[PDB]
Amino acid sequence: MGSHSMRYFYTSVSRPGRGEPRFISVGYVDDTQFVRFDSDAASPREEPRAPWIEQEGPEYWDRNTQIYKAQAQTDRESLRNLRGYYNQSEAGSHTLQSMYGCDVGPDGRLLRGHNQYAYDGKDYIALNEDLRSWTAADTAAQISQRKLEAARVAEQLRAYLEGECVEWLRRYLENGKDKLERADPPKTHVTHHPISDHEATLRCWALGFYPAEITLTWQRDGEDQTQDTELVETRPAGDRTFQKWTAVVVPSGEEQRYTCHVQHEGLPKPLTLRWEPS
């Protein structure tokens, strides 16, 4: 509780025969996206994707734009190098993803930092939680590891993660505050959907909530049930909020033996819900 994160998610995708690799970057505070950049835009620039960041001055947008353009160029070198490390053909498309950022507590102090990479969707190399050492997946990534060590890169990342990452995340939370520090509890209900003469589905809904983290669980006679349940992935409503449901198939006539249990940061205490045949 009360903790926050900032994250940047970079995607570079090669496309031999169809130009240079695309670079896309999005930035988030918790579950709220606030910026983007796309190298395939007509005039690539970092752009606002939340209202509260629009106040930042031209020097912010300019700096960050120049960062992404340089990162795009660096990722293109990385893609070339990785193709070589894996003895791969120049004819295929490959993906390099990058994630970094910081987690802070209620007091604003660093809880942990992150800086890791994936190649073709598989973990490649990661900054360890010490912010000093690396973990490599395989002999290709050991090459990258030696290069990062030689250039003293962990040191630079540590300084960013302990320093600017936290400091800017705090600035966003403080002026961004009405949206970022506000948890919205789910609105909850249970619906009933006859399947046959013998069985019915009970579906336990959670709507309009933020942040995305939630737990929904069905019990029978006060015992956790996973048999004959279905739990959908938490999904975005499009208005900053999220939705989720869990369902269970029950013998018709036994509906009142089932309870749905809801836990969310916006809730003072967990909820338990039953179907109410109105």
Partner: peptide, 9 residues
């Protein structure tokens, strides 16, 4: 606020 480019892999 993003970090800079670092070094290639």
């Amino acid at each position: 606020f993003p970090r800079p480019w670092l070094h290639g892999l």
